[PDB]
Design an enzyme around this catalytic site. Sequence first.
Site, PDB file in Angstrom:
ATOM      1  CB  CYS A 154      -0.937   0.070   1.207  1.00 49.65           C
ATOM      2  SG  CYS A 154      -1.735  -1.469   1.435  1.00 49.65           S
ATOM      3  CG  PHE A 198      -7.556  -4.656   0.698  1.00 54.64           C
ATOM      4  CD1 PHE A 198      -6.646  -3.616   0.594  1.00 54.64           C
ATOM      5  CD2 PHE A 198      -7.360  -5.612   1.680  1.00 54.64           C
ATOM      6  CE1 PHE A 198      -5.561  -3.530   1.453  1.00 54.64           C
ATOM      7  CE2 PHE A 198      -6.275  -5.531   2.547  1.00 54.64           C
ATOM      8  CZ  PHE A 198      -5.377  -4.489   2.431  1.00 54.64           C
ATOM      9  CG  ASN A 227      -6.473   0.167   1.411  1.00 52.75           C
ATOM     10  OD1 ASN A 227      -5.762   0.450   0.445  1.00 52.75           O
ATOM     11  ND2 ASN A 227      -5.970  -0.147   2.593  1.00 52.75           N
TER      12      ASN A 227
END
Lengths: 389, 388
Positions: free
Chosen positions: B163, B214, B335
Amino acid sequence: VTVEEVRKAQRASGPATVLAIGTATPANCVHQADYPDYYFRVTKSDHLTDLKEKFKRMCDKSMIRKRYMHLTEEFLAENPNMCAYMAPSLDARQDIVVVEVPKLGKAAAQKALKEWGQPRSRITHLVFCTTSGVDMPGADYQLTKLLGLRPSVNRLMMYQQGCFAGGTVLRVAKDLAENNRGARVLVVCSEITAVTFRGPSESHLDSLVGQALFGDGAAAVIVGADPDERAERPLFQLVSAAQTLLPDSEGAIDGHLREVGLTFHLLKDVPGLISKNIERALEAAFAPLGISDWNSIFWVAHPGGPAILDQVEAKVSLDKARMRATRHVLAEYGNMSSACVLFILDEMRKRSAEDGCATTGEGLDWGVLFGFGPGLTVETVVLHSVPIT
Amino acid sequence: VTVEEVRKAQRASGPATVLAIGTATPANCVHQADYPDYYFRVTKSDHLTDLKEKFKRMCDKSMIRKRYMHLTEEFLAENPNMCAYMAPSLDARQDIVVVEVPKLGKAAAQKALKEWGQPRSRITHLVFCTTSGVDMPGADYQLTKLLGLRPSVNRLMMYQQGCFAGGTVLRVAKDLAENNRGARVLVVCSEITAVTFRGPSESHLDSLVGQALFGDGAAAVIVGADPDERAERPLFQLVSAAQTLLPDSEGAIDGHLREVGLTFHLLKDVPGLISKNIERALEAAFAPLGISDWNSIFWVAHPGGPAILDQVEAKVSLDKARMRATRHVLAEYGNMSSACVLFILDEMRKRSAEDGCATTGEGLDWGVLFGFGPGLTVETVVLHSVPI
Ligand SMILES: CC(C)(COP(=O)(O)OP(=O)(O)OC[C@H]1O[C@@H](n2cnc3c(N)ncnc32)[C@H](O)[C@@H]1OP(=O)(O)O)[C@@H](O)C(=O)NCCC(=O)NCCS
Ligand SMILES: O=C1C[C@@H](c2ccc(O)cc2)Oc2cc(O)cc(O)c21
Ligand SMILES: O=C1C[C@@H](c2ccc(O)cc2)Oc2cc(O)cc(O)c21
């Protein structure tokens, strides 16, 4: 107070310079004269006597005298899934390379650092490149902990790259060192064939070629601009770096990471594709420098196989002496994927000192480094030698 | 010709500048309010009623309104090993992302290239970054073909980064553009959750949290130094870039590519470690520039989860407006790993233009971009806005 002010204080002046090289390999040595018997034994393939004759030819013609491999007979005997041509085994292979690739690269980096003579804490960037294994955090993180580099080291993790990445990492380190005043880049390529080792398949002879050619090894270079002449000893100057894709080379060199591990595809056109395109790459690199005589520059080339060096030699009419440093690393270490060219750079400058040449590049001033790999991509780095007193 | 003459006639003079930004997602959309029912149905786990309650609360507290997922219920029905928590499925997952990651990247890259408006042949460098899948030749090569970029484009392929790599790609692009006269760098982060999507397990709640946060997306940015005044439009200036590893963070975020795909493991209170440590990174980046008021700069932070933003905002007493663009992207996209900060950068310059702010950075001159990920790694990129 202004961005232009920061950009002037930032940024270095001179060209990226190689300041040290170090290399390491697993201790387990495997001699090519024994490999056909050894390989066909541990893979329980002795009944494939016709295929074994083919492998004896490939290993005899490989121009490889020995290789180093972390894999042992004792381990393989406990891991028949890795000895089959294609069995579930990625987890077992990952467990090896995720630990051993940073471990091997640590052995190489220590030797480069030692010869560099400067404290590890001075290293500002780390470029770690492998083709065996992936993990989060990556091998760059592990190496940083193993060596005790500063926590604020700028790390670039080059994963699953292939055999052109020896040239890639120098192209990367060139821009890092050159754009950051004081920057000192540690560059590590570390390759371990536990991910690609597998048994033999008569229907995939190109994979069989991989088993005769690929070996383990790691090499490390420290690259920086504006060398301290009092404390640092330059070896080579990085003048320019380029990447390109060869025409009509789609599918020439493939490799997929799957549940059976890392697979390997290789067309028979690879020697022809490289030799037939190398002059376009030489002209692109050296024409703006005014150089056209390819026998007047030293040569570093990734030794993908002996056929590549033979056909590049013939196509460009090179003197046999120019490939010597490349052929020596092939002979003594085999195909170590991205680490090869850094090994050859190390062998070029050592022999240049032993023979008493005027420069680290066999007495010649300008040189070229070639990486070949999946794409088919060709990485070209122009080098300049340094005088030997 | 000497090597000195080369260096002088080789380098650029100005700072690396963001000249265009484009984003793209898969079309298939899942609203968080609907995901606990959908997720537990497709994974055949409706009988774990206590776990579902936990996963609802995970989803309720995620502060995500919706995410885009290339994976459809029709596809998952044919791939039960991907719906199981732990079943051999790497090969199927690889088969997806090896094709779809560059495809989603080209959707965003084509948007950024259109805004830039310059011919594709002028692109000299490509930085491609993904945490979903690996392959040789890589997604960078696939994107070169799909876009018809020059065969001689200098490609950097960043695999399995995590990330924080949204900042890493700007740090890479900064040095490429600035050290090479005329260089125009295409930066593409493309992420697709088919490698990490898996069913629930009651003894692995850290994996279950990932199922809540996610999403899929891709973002593209074109970077160059020395913009042409008539033909290009600076949005942001990359001033500096730094990477550090946080003390006492060993094992806080681990991810392993295994035969069951990419697994996800947490271990050490990530929001505490980032906020406990964020001020050190701010001072390292801005003390050389005479700034100390973290409310006087615009903020782009990787929205790993809401708790990270909350605790960081509270640690330095940030006004609620500084985290606004970041929270908006988290809410509408989830995300998206490395691509998130690039989405937020786009949202910020657009919202700053929609409203009548003086600069692309919400009216402020200096800005900070943060990437967080496995390490614990923190990437810090100092930005400077452009007057609107
Ligand atoms: C493999 C090699 C060492 C063999 O040495 P050689 O003196 O040229 O002998 P040959 O050309 O007859 O090749 C040996 C056998 O392997 C096979 N061979 C060579 N390359 C092959 C390939 N990509 N795929 C399948 N088989 C191959 C040949 O068909 C031959 O089989 P045969 O005895 O039935 O005819 C040599 O061909 C070579 O160096 N090839 C380059 C390999 C390469 O591309 N490396 C880059 C790796 S990324
Ligand atoms: O077989 C050869 C080739 C030879 C050679 C290289 C370059 C050249 O120009 C002429 C000859 O060098 C070698 C050197 C060795 O230690 C062992 C060898 O087996 C060989
Ligand atoms: O060209 C060769 C042949 C090679 C070799 C010898 C024996 C063997 O079994 C396999 C390969 O050794 C070399 C060693 C060198 O330093 C330089 C070289 O040019 C070569």
